[PDB]
Amino acid sequence: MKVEIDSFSGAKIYPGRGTLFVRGDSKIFRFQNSKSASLFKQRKNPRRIAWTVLFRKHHKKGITEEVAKKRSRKTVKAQRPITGASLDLIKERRSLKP
């Protein structure tokens, strides 16, 4: 069960909802409803239509806490010497000097 999203508005299209358009270049366009569907056919440009996802994105609207800092990282610090080099002679070889 794929919930699709509108190729105009951007809202999720749940099963059965909305309409599907196969353009002549065989590019597919899905609409959640008649509103986007018409507005698409009207040659409106979504980045000019205030309520579309494209619009709010392009205009940077409401992304605040998704722009904040995050902690994702790791720690290893291990020793697994060169292969066939007898790693039993590769440990006592490095404490270094300095």
Partner: protein, 136 residues
Amino acid sequence: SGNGAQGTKFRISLGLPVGAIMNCADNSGARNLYIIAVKGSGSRLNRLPAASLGDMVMATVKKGKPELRKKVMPAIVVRQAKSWRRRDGVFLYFEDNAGVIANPKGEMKGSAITGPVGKECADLWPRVASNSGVVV
């Protein structure tokens, strides 16, 4: 439908009543197909026989290689315009009305099919599957 069309066909909304003219999507030289009938249709007083994507119709050629013209030949609707609905619940529609000229068996005439094609047409007609790049 009904002759050389392997498998069956779930009912699809009828976009093409007789007299409709649809684009010809193959390389046969035929520009358009004027629908004079629909194979395997019904009868009701004053009802226009209609065709849907995947149906076989008898048609003619209004614009085309003059060797295709003034003659009746079978054809298969590859693309609708009218919004139809599959069992998976989607309401979908193509941009144009289109079909290709075909022999009664359901074998093509030309070797290529320009533009996308419905799966309902594809699943149904083997030869169409061959020449069709973009399904649905």
